[PDB]
Amino acid sequence: SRTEWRVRAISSTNLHLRTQHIYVNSDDVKDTGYTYILPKNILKKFITISDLRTQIAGFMYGVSPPDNPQVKEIRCIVLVPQTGSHQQVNLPTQLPDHELLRDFEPLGWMHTQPNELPQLSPQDVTTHAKLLTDNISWDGEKTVMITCSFTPGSVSLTAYKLTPSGYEWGKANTDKGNNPKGYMPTHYEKVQMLLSDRFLGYFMVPSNGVWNYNFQGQRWSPAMKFDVCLSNPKEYYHEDHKPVHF
Numbered sequence: 001s002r003t004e005w006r007v008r009a010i011s012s013t014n015l016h017l018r019t020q021h022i023y024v025n026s027d028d029v030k031d032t033g034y035t036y037i038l039p040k041n042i043l044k045k046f047i048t049i050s051d052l053r054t055q056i057a058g059f060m061y062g063v064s065p066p067d068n069p070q071v072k073e074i075r076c077i078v079l080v081p082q083t084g085s086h087q088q089v090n091l092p093t094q095l096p097d098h099e100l101l102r103d104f105e106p107l108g109w110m111h112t113q114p115n116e117l118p119q120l121s122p123q124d125v126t127t128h129a130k131l132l133t134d135n136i137s138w139d140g141e142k143t144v145m146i147t148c149s150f151t152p153g154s155v156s157l158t159a160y161k162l163t164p165s166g167y168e169w170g171k172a173n174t175d176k177g178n179n180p181k182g183y184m185p186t187h188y189e190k191v192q193m194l195l196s197d198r199f200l201g202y203f204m205v206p207s208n209g210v211w212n213y214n215f216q217g218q219r220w221s222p223a224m225k226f227d228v229c230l231s232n233p234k235e236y237y238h239e240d241h242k243p244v245h246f
Helices: 002-012 015-020 040-048 122-134 164-172
Strands: 022-024 035-039 057-063 071-078 105-113 144-151 154-162 188-196 202-206 228-230
Touching (some): 015 040, 022 188, 035 040, 040 071, 040 144, 071 105, 122 154, 154 164
Parallel strands (some): 022 154, 035 071, 035 188, 071 202
Antiparallel strands (some): 057 071, 154 188, 202 228
16 A cells, blocks of 8 residues: 555654653673663664564674773664564675774674563574674674664663573574573673763665665565665665565
């Protein structure tokens, strides 16, 4: 329905309201490790281009502040060609590559999620374990996952790191659902994160100007190759994201 598309596009412009009420779960995090600082400007933009029901994601890149070795500031988010569901996001096996990105530190990924969950999803752990094993540039000691859970009238953020055992389990997991065998809360660990407007972050999207393939699944595949470039991200229901035909 072309009319439905226009209606959803309209209601989605109210997503920015949720970024007025942001929550960050820093509850009982170990005092050992890194603290992640996410810029408010990119978190808000990330929410405005997202969707309440279908998850989207982006890879995070950042730097190490000269005077605090235990702090990692996220300065760039890269949106890759993708598709997703209420339970997970589907990303190409090929990591983004660009001269501008090679001098940053890969810090993991972030993604939206329909509802707040009592535990990190088994899917997230599996997706993260895959990203680690395949990419030598991904340091398990610094890469993390930030979940942006939509809660009534707001968004709730949490950052996690995989545990050595979680990495092992994730690398072997074979059932995408919500209760895989052997899944324990001891497979992941919460990490400290801050939402700050002290500095700005930037976005990089596919060079063909299309990151959202949720209405063009036939043009998406895990093996697809792509390039990226600096740019302001297009919303979920942007003109260029609609299906080749309704």
